[PDB]
Design a protein around this ligand. Structure first.
Ligand SMILES: C[N+]1(C)[C@@H]2C[C@@H](OC(=O)[C@H](CO)c3ccccc3)C[C@H]1[C@@H]1O[C@@H]12
Ligand SMILES: [Hg+2]
Ligand SMILES: [Hg+2]
Ligand SMILES: [Hg+2]
Length: 384
């Protein structure tokens, strides 16, 4: 049997690789926040706790589950089985309520801007996270570890490992409704109000100008400099015709409004001088003209202040990675209520692993898309 042996070797290598990636990715996130004060924001306190739960899944949950399935039975005894099940459900429950914290915290920043942001400190973020881990422990740990003593008998036979009060299929489904389906519904409606609040005009023109200015700096060919120069110049004219939040509410004839438009008139003059050199053949000099643009922009940035579009996109990615990876297991629980043979044990293992995969791809939802995390990752990996 040369094939059944290769499947075991393939599974061990794939499981060990996923566990290793989950460990490294989440440690890099947690260490980056600790060593860089620029990453010590309220949002990253919630991501630190999220990466903290993902690290426990990669270290304990993934490895103990791989040993369980490869050997074919539970070899570590009943005590370690209860501790593993309790740790798995508490850490998972803390993740779900962590996503609820991120969703509600973002909801009150767009619906209560005159009240909530001033109440949004790292001490409040630490208390909400601490309360989430305490509530998760109280909900799952005593029931998983001590239900056998309440009923007075341990029905989990030797070599088996499962939650004892889940012997009733309807009980498992009620758990799926309260611990997964209801939270996902809440996070979906919360995001629906987030994207509708994002869907005012001054932030859209200034963000387009700054984003296309970076594209010129890191452009590989001549098509990326032409598209960025035109789309930025279009956004610069729409940002010039509008009035910024100026002090004292000054008329268009004021020296503040005249010099504000004059700052954009200098920028368009340098943009067309960069567009010229890009067509003369000095595409490298047009990229050197972007530094002159960044100087003029910085010389007249005192009239303006938004990365909130990226923040909303980041939350959606974190929520979708949670829904997509945890949905297959929960529909198996639903089908299990009326047809247990409809879900083979191989399908159960796959659905259980997909939930673990949520911890693997979670850092890639935000860390590999944020400019500050990338710079800190490079610094953590270079040899001093
Ligand atoms: C570690 N898991 C893979 C186990 C199986 C799944 O369980 C669930 O999806 C249920 C809701 O049906 C759930 C339990 C606790 C917290 C959140 C969800 C995902 C997580 C959770 O700890 C268990
Ligand atoms: Hg941790
Ligand atoms: Hg933790
Ligand atoms: Hg992702």
């Amino acid at each position: 049997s040369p094939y059944k042996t290769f499947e075991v070797v393939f599974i061990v290598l794939v499981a060990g690789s996923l566990s290793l990636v989950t460990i490294i990715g989440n440690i890099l996130v947690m260490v980056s926040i600790k060593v860089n004060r620029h990453l010590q924001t309220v949002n990253n306190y919630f991501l630190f706790s999220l990466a903290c739960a993902d690290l426990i899944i990669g270290v304990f949950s993934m490895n103990l589950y791989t040993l369980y399935t490869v050997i074919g039975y539970w070899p570590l005894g009943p005590v370690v089985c209860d501790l593993w099940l309790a740790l798995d459900y508490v850490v998972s429950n803390a993740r779900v309520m962590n996503l609820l914290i991120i969703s509600f915290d973002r909801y009150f920043c767009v619906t209560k801007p005159l009240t909530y942001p001033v109440k949004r400190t790292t001490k409040m973020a630490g208390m909400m996270i601490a309360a989430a881990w305490v509530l998760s422990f109280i909900l799952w740990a005593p029931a998983i570890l001590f239900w056998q003593f309440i009923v007075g008998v341990r029905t989990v036979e030797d070599g088996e490992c499962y939650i004892q009060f889940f012997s009733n299929a309807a009980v498992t489904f009620g758990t799926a409704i309260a611990a997964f389906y209801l939270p996902v519904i809440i996070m979906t409606v919360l995001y629906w109000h987030i994207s509708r609040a994002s869907k005012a005009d001054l932030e859209d023109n200034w963000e387009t100008l700054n984003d296309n200015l970076k594209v010129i700096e890191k452009a590989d060919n001549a098509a990326q400099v032409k598209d960025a120069l035109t789309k930025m110049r279009a956004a610069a004219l729409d940002a010039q015709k509008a009035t910024p939040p100026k002090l004292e509410d000054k008329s268009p004839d004021s020296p503040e409004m005249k010099d504000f438009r004059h700052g954009f008139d200098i920028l368009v003059g340098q943009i067309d001088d960069a567009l010229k050199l890009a067509n003369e053949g000095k595409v490298k000099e047009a990229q050197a003209a972007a530094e002159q643009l960044k100087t003029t922009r910085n010389a007249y940035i005192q009239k303006y202040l938004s990365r909130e579009k990226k923040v909303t996109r980041t939350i959606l990615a974190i929520l979708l990675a949670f829904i997509i990876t945890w949905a297959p297991y929960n529909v198996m629980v639903l089908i299990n209520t009326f047809c247990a043979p409809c879900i083979p044990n191989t399908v159960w293992t796959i659905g259980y692993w997909l939930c673990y995969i949520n911890s693997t791809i979670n850092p890639a939802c935000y860390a590999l898309c944020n400019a500050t995390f990338k710079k800190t990752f490079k610094h953590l990996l270079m040899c001093h």
